Design a protein around this motif. Structure first.
Motif, short mmCIF file in Angstrom:
data_model
loop_
_atom_site.label_atom_id
_atom_site.label_comp_id
_atom_site.label_asym_id
_atom_site.label_seq_id
_atom_site.Cartn_x
_atom_site.Cartn_y
_atom_site.Cartn_z
N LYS B 1 0.87 -1.21 0.00
CA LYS B 1 0.00 0.00 0.00
C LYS B 1 0.89 1.23 0.00
CE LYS B 1 -3.88 -0.38 2.34
NZ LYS B 1 -3.62 1.07 2.12
N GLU B 2 0.53 2.22 -0.82
CA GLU B 2 1.26 3.47 -0.91
C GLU B 2 1.07 4.25 0.39
OE1 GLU B 2 -0.33 6.12 -3.89
OE2 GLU B 2 1.69 6.76 -4.49
N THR B 3 2.14 4.83 0.94
CA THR B 3 1.99 5.65 2.13
C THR B 3 1.24 6.95 1.79
OG1 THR B 3 4.00 6.99 1.88
CG2 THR B 3 4.24 4.86 3.04
N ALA B 4 0.69 7.61 2.80
CA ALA B 4 -0.05 8.83 2.56
C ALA B 4 0.87 9.92 2.01
CB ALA B 4 -0.74 9.29 3.84
N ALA B 5 2.09 9.99 2.53
CA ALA B 5 3.02 11.01 2.08
C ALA B 5 3.41 10.78 0.63
CB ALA B 5 4.27 11.04 2.96
N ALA B 6 3.64 9.52 0.27
CA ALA B 6 4.03 9.19 -1.10
C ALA B 6 2.89 9.43 -2.08
CB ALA B 6 4.50 7.74 -1.16
N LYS B 7 1.67 9.14 -1.65
CA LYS B 7 0.50 9.41 -2.48
C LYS B 7 0.37 10.91 -2.75
CE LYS B 7 -4.47 8.55 -2.82
NZ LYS B 7 -5.65 7.93 -2.16
N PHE B 8 0.60 11.73 -1.73
CA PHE B 8 0.56 13.18 -1.92
C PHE B 8 1.60 13.62 -2.93
CE2 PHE B 8 -0.32 17.58 -0.78
CZ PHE B 8 0.86 18.18 -1.15
N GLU B 9 2.82 13.09 -2.82
CA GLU B 9 3.87 13.43 -3.77
C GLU B 9 3.45 13.09 -5.20
OE1 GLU B 9 7.44 12.68 -0.51
OE2 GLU B 9 6.92 11.11 -1.96
N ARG B 10 2.97 11.87 -5.39
CA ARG B 10 2.58 11.42 -6.72
C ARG B 10 1.42 12.24 -7.31
NH1 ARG B 10 -1.38 7.87 -8.33
NH2 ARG B 10 -1.67 7.18 -6.16
#
Ligand SMILES: [Cl-]
Ligand SMILES: [Cl-]
Lengths: 124, 124
Positions: B1-10
């Motif tokens: 699962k993508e982390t919340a921080a990484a999802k925001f970056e993407r």
């Protein structure tokens, strides 16, 4: 019960000023438009254009709403707006708001006959 | 699962350009950031500043989020952004987006250790 169109007018229209003139604009407007009655509305945008100009957006650019609905419209022109958002010091019944004035396109959801704004979605 | 921080970056960072250079920016970016895989994400904002500058917002002005949470922060400065929103012609798997470039304050929700952006709330 307040109609959806009337609620939009009360929450989002301020045609009597060209712009926020001071940092206290939001405290004053949030109170007077009855948005701090039982609790502090966290975020609210006022549009400083005529009611006619804001209603006209409902026949301008059709764009998606954030929630996925397709009845949103983006104003062709930028409009004077003020965003009001609660600060950290804000605690009901002593609501406290930061006032941020900007000139941006507005995005509203439209409904009804006449087809008029019923929600403020965002500004760009 | 993508982390919340990484999802925001993407979803929300585009530090490789100073601004949208054309009307096709959104079609291209929504596809490449994998925001049109199974369906068209209706609305999405990209920020044209360094990751460091966007992360720094988490220690700037604390403001209410639209949903009433108190972990939102408004950037002290305006930033270059592009809003991407589906047009009427948009129909999966042929997503189609309007590209609107602007310079505005951003508002992000922050969480975690390190305390970093996890949601894009709005721009002003
Ligand atoms: Cl609002
Ligand atoms: Cl977004």
């Amino acid at each position: 019960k307040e109609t959806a169109a009337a609620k939009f007018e009360r929450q989002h229209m301020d045609s009597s000023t060209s712009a926020a003139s001071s940092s206290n604009y939001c405290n004053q407007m949030m109170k007077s438009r009855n948005l701090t009655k039982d609790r502090c509305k966290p975020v609210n945008t006022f549009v400083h254009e005529s009611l006619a100009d804001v209603q006209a957006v409902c026949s301008q650019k059709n764009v998606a709403c954030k929630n996925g609905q397709t009845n949103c419209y983006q104003s062709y022109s930028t409009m004077s707006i003020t965003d009001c958002r609660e600060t950290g010091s804000s605690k009901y019944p002593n609501c406290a708001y930061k006032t941020t004035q900007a000139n941006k396109h507005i995005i509203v959801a439209c409904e009804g006959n006449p087809y008029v704004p019923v929600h403020f979605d965002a500004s760009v």
